[PDB]
């Protein structure tokens, strides 16, 4: 399993952001709104292949979560689909980026703003967000935003759609790596 692939919790389906590790411990990152209240994660809609269990979750305010792998045989690729990821970086205005998610696949675009505040309502406000002109749709939450072999962010939310065009906000991945003390590989 790699960045962009579906992940299923008790409640719905999200996308795997990035495979990360600390020491000999493998985890994956996804959106915090996805990890909020989820315990176990599976690889398939049938909930037959276990992946692991949530170890952390930060939403709202931020929008990142981490799940610890408990499945021993599943390959945990350090990629996004076939794409190798070798490092993490800070987004910059004008940066060309690509997103991958479980519903819409791969779409590209560019970073249009930094430090955006997005209000999803009912007190769910997130801060510090990367704004882009990449589209995304339900199911794509938590998938990776990357640029070449660099990890940049995790899909959080936005408006519009892939047919007509949209704006998507992403949580900086650097922030998540630092909070959990993990790194991409």
């Amino acid at each position: 399993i790699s960045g962009g692939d579906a992940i299923y919790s008790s409640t719905g389906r999200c996308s795997l952001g990035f495979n990360v590790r600390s020491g000999s411990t493998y985890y994956f990152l996804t959106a915090g709104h996805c990890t909020d209240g989820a315990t176990t994660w599976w690889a398939n809609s049938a909930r037959t292949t276990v992946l692991g269990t949530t170890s952390g979750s930060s939403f709202p305010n931020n929008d990142y979560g981490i799940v610890r792998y408990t499945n021993t045989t599943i390959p945990k690729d350090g990629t996004v689909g076939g794409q190798d990821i070798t490092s993490a970086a800070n987004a910059t205005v004008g940066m060309a980026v690509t997103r991958r998610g479980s519903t819409t696949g791969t779409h590209s675009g560019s970073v249009t703003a930094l430090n955006a505040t997005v209000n999803y309502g009912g007190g769910d406000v997130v801060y510090g967000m990367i704004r882009t002109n990449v589209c995304a749709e339900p199911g794509d939450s938590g998938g990776p935003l990357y640029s070449g072999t660099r990890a940049i962010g995790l899909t959080s939310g936005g408006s519009g759609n892939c047919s007509s065009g949209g704006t998507t906000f992403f949580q900086p991945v650097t922030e998540a790596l630092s909070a959990y003390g993990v790194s991409v590989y």
């Binding site: 209000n119 999803y120 009912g122 749709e137 339900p138 794509d140 939450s141 936005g158």
Partner: protein, 51 residues
């Protein structure tokens, strides 16, 4: 599902489908509710889950 707090400028993108009266599967409530608004209250919920 109540769409009174709608519209919303942004929606999160987890997938928990709802089936609209237009026969379209809406990927989550936020998405469904903004469509209801955009349709000026014409669109309704047929049932939960994919159409």
């Amino acid at each position: 599902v109540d769409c009174s707090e709608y519209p919303k400028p942004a929606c999160t993108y987890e997938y928990r489908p709802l089936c609209g009266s237009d026969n379209k599967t809406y990927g989550n409530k936020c998405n469904f509710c903004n469509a209801v608004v955009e349709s000026n209250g014409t669109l309704t919920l047929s049932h939960f889950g994919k159409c």
